[PDB]
Point group: C4
Chain length 94, copies 4
Amino acid sequence: KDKEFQVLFVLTILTLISGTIFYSTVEGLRPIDALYFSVVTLTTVGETPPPQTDFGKIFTILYIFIGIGLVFGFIHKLAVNVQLPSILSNLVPR
Amino acid sequence: KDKEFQVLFVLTILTLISGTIFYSTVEGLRPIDALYFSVVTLTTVGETPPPQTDFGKIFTILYIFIGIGLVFGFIHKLAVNVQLPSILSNLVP
Amino acid sequence: KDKEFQVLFVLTILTLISGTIFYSTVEGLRPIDALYFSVVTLTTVGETPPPQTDFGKIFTILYIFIGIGLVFGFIHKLAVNVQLPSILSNLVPR
Amino acid sequence: KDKEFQVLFVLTILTLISGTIFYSTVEGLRPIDALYFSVVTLTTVGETPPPQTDFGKIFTILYIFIGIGLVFGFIHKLAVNVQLPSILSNLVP
C-alpha cells in the first residue's frame, strides 16, 4: 500500500471524523452534512454557507489551518502513489 | 502536446462527463449546470450551492478526493507543456 | 524587476481585463463586480453566486482551465521573487 | 520551529489582523466575522457572501494577491516543519 499513504489516509479520516462530530454537535447538522462541510472546507471548495455560531467560526478557522495541509498532502500522495500507478497499469496493452 | 498531456486531457474529460451524467440524473440538473458544478467543484472554485440529496453529497465527497488530483495535474501539464511553450514562441521577435 | 514576473504580471492583468470585459457585457455587471468575480474565480476563492447565462457558464469553465495556471504562477513568482526579497531586506538590522 | 516558521507565523497573524481591522471598520463586521472572512478568503475556502462596498471589493482583490502567497507558505512550513516532525515522533514505538 505504502505506509505513508496509509498514515496520511488515517489522519485525514481522523480529521474528517473530528469535524463531523464537531459540526453535528455544535452547528446542529446531520452527520452527512457535518462530514460534507468538513470535506468541502478542508479541500477549500467551500460551496456551503458559513458556520452560524462563534465557536463554529473559531473552530473552523483553526480546523482549516491545521487541516488543509494534511488533506492536500493526502490528495498529493493518493494521486502520485495510488492513482498514477493504477493509470499506468491500465495503459498497458495486453 | 505529448502522450501525457493527451491522456491527462482525456481523463479530465471523462471525469467531467461522469460528473455531468451524475448530477443531471441525480440532482436533476440541466447538463450545462451539471457540467458547470463538476468543473467548479473539482477546481475547488465552488461558487454554487451544495448538492440537495444525500447520494449527491456522498458522491461529491468521493468525486472531490479522486478527481481534484487529476484535474490539478492536467492544469499543471497544460500550463507547463502547452501554455508556457506557446508564450515562449510568441515572445520571440 | 525580473522579466518573468513582469510577463506573468502582464498576462494576469490581460486575463483579468478580458474577464472584466466579458462579465460586465454578458452578465450585466458593473466593471468593479466583473473584475471582482474574475479575480475570486481564478484564485478559486469563489464567494459570489454563479453566472446566470449559459454563455457565462461556458466561458467561465474555459476561463478557469486556461486562467488558473497563469494566475497561480503569477502568485508563486510574486511570492518567491518579489515578496520574499522584500521581507528579507526588511528583516535586516540597521 | 526555526526563525522561518516563526516569522511566517507573525506575518500571517499581521495579515489577518489587518483584514480583521479593515473588514470590521469598512464592511461593518463584528471582529469575529471580519477575522473569519479574512481567513476563509486568503485560504481560498470562501464560504461566505462577497464584500458589499466598492472599497471592500478593491481591498479584497489586492488582499488576495498579496496575502494568498504568505498564507499558503505558512501552511506549507507548518505542515513540513511542525506537523510532520510531530507525527514522526509520535509514530516511534
